[PDB]
């Protein structure tokens with residue numbers, strides 16, 4: 001039983017728009033912050049790579065559905081490119097070509113018995129909105145509402161699963177370095193917190209919008225996808241345990257405390273540590289933005305499920321390090337990784353499958369067992385079809401998740417593997433491979449071909465169990 005998926009559990013795979021679509025300026029699409037980064041700052045990206053073509057999924061979406069059907073995916077999670085739909089960011093102009101494209105993908109999926117799951121924002125902000133300051137500027141909350149309305153109106157008759165934002169803990173860091181993630185702004189400890197504040201407001205506006213304008217007719221569900229690493233105490237001390245709790249609150253709780261708790265607001269430890277640090281460093285005002293009581297009430301409860309993006313673990317010990325000001329410094333933990341853990345092609349990603357089970361339990365206890373949909377989980381290598389490391393990564397993580405479900409009572413309701421295919425890996429370009437399908441980026445046809453991991457995942461999806469040969 002511990003090796004069998006619940007009957008209603010949904011299995012599939014996932015992608016993101018900039019990572020796969022290409023057609024970056026085709027048929028009216030406007031520029032986004034990733035177009036800007038890869039065009040203006042190729043020195044920030046391995047090989048000077050761009051997403052101009054990527055997997056060419058704008059043209060090849062039927063091939064994506066074909067491989068999803070082969071895989072036996074029940075669900076496909078993909079994102080919508082804001083600037084493909086609203087080229088100016090604001091809702092004054094709707095690009096029919098973008099409407100047609102996503103309709104064509106949705107219809108193709110449904111005709112092949114695959115459910116669409118749509119992420120509204122996976123990091124590709126229209127440049128016109130970044131030029132107002134981007135996420136640190138609260139005006140973007142209403143702009144996000146208006147974007148979401150166009151999506152609900154056009155697609156919500158057929159799309160019943162939505163995520164507002166993907167991994168805002170990661171994308172907020174685009175406001176914490178001059179050479180980092182788009183838009184590559186150096187405001188650590190100040191602008192990144194403002195970005196988070198706006199995103200939380202935006203998410204809440206989108207959820208209320210669904211309630212007010214769409215839910216009764218459409219009957220779908222709206223969540224948010226949060227990334228989080230497990231943080232294991234470096235030793236069993238109370239002090240090291242405290243540092244790991246700090247980590248969870250500063251990374252997951254930053255977003256999840258305002259939305260998923262009865263109390264709402266940011267975690268107390270976040271408010272208190274930033275307040276103290278700001279005062280000590282001479283600021284009149286805390287660097288952490290504040291919610292009013294009315295905003296706290298508006299934001300709390302804005303969820304039908306929790307999306308989780310899980311990859312890895314860190315070790316945490318008591319202490320403070322990092323630059324002043326920064327979120328890492330404010331968090332009051334010293335982070336390392338254990339040399340013994342298996343590696344990947346990504347410096348940040350080590351294989352720690354039991355950390356997945358620990359994280360799922362932490363979430364269950366902190367948020368009163370919300371329905372959890374694993375929206376990303378996956379592994380990098382440098383290439384190859386005989387991807388034994390990736391096969392092991394998936395079979396172990398899925399076993400740990402199934403223990404969380406069956407042994408620990410965690411309400412996990414679905415899982416989409418990251419990623420369906422090798423794609424543009426952000427600042428790493430095409431150098432790191434996360435796909436279960438390989439893609440030849442030197443071949444203009446961008447053929448997708450199954451790796452061993454795709455064959456193993458198909459077997460899991462078909463049999464609805466972990467095969468015997470992968471069991472402990």
Ligand SMILES: OC[C@H]1O[C@@H](O[C@H]2[C@H](O)[C@@H](O)[C@H](O)O[C@@H]2CO)[C@H](O)[C@@H](O)[C@@H]1O
Nearest residue numbers: 166167170227228229309311348376426
């Ligand atoms: O692009 C791969 C994957 O990255 C995720 O972010 C990583 C980040 O790169 C790393 O520095 C940090 O320690 O861990 C996070 C994951 O928690 C991002 O969240 C994913 O959405 C993305 O697909």
Ligand SMILES: [Cl-]
Nearest residue numbers: 467468469470
């Ligand atoms: Cl066997």
Ligand code: NA
Nearest residue numbers: 094150153154
């Ligand atoms: Na419209």
